[PDB]
Amino acid sequence: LESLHSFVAAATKELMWLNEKEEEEVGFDWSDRNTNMTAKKESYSALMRELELKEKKIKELQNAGDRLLREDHPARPTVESFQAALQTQWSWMLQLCCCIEAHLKENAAYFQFFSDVREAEGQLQKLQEALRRKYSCDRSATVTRLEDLLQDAQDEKEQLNEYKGHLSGLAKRAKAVVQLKPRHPAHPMRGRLPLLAVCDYKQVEVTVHKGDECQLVGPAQPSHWKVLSSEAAVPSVCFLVPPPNQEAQEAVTRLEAQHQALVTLWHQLHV
Query: What is the rounded distance in angstroms from the CA atom of residue 261 to the CA atom of residue 86?
Result: 63
Stretch that binds Ca ion, among 147-155, 188-196, 203-211, 255-263 (CB under 5 A): 147-155
Question: How crowded is residue 103: how many other Cβ atoms within 10 Å of its Cβ?
Answer: 24
Question: How crowded is residue 240: how many other Cβ atoms within 10 Å of its Cβ?
Answer: 21
The reply to whether 151 sits near Ca ion by the rule CB under 5 A is yes
In the complex, the smallest distance separating the C-beta of residue 161 from Ca ion, rounded to whole angstroms, is 18
- The alpha carbon dihedral of 187, 188, 194, 197 has a sign of positive
H-helix or E-strand spanning residue 195: strand 193-197
Residues 224-253 that bind Ca ion (CB under 5 A): none
Contact present, 86 and 11 (Cβ < 8 Å): yes
Stretch that binds Ca ion, among 82-90, 146-154, 219-227, 237-245 (CB under 5 A): 146-154
In the complex, the smallest distance separating the C-beta of residue 129 from Ca ion, rounded to whole angstroms, is 18
In the complex, the smallest distance separating the C-beta of residue 141 from Ca ion, rounded to whole angstroms, is 16
In the complex, the smallest distance separating the C-beta of residue 139 from Ca ion, rounded to whole angstroms, is 11
Contact present, 19 and 90 (Cβ < 8 Å): no
CA dist 261 → 19, 102, 171, 255, 265 (Å): 57, 39, 18, 10, 6
Taking the least distance from each CB to Ca ion, the nearer of 137 and 204 is 137
Stretch that binds Ca ion, among 86-94, 124-132, 152-160, 230-238 (CB under 5 A): 152-160
Tell me the number of residues near Ca ion by CB under 5 A. 3
Taking the least distance from each CB to Ca ion, the nearer of 71 and 152 is 152
Taking the least distance from each CB to Ca ion, the nearer of 1 and 149 is 149
Stretch that binds Ca ion, among 4-12, 88-96, 142-150, 201-209 (CB under 5 A): 142-150
H-helix or E-strand spanning residue 54: helix 37-70
The reply to whether 159 sits near Ca ion by the rule CB under 5 A is no
Binding site for Ca ion (CB under 5 A): 148, 151, 153
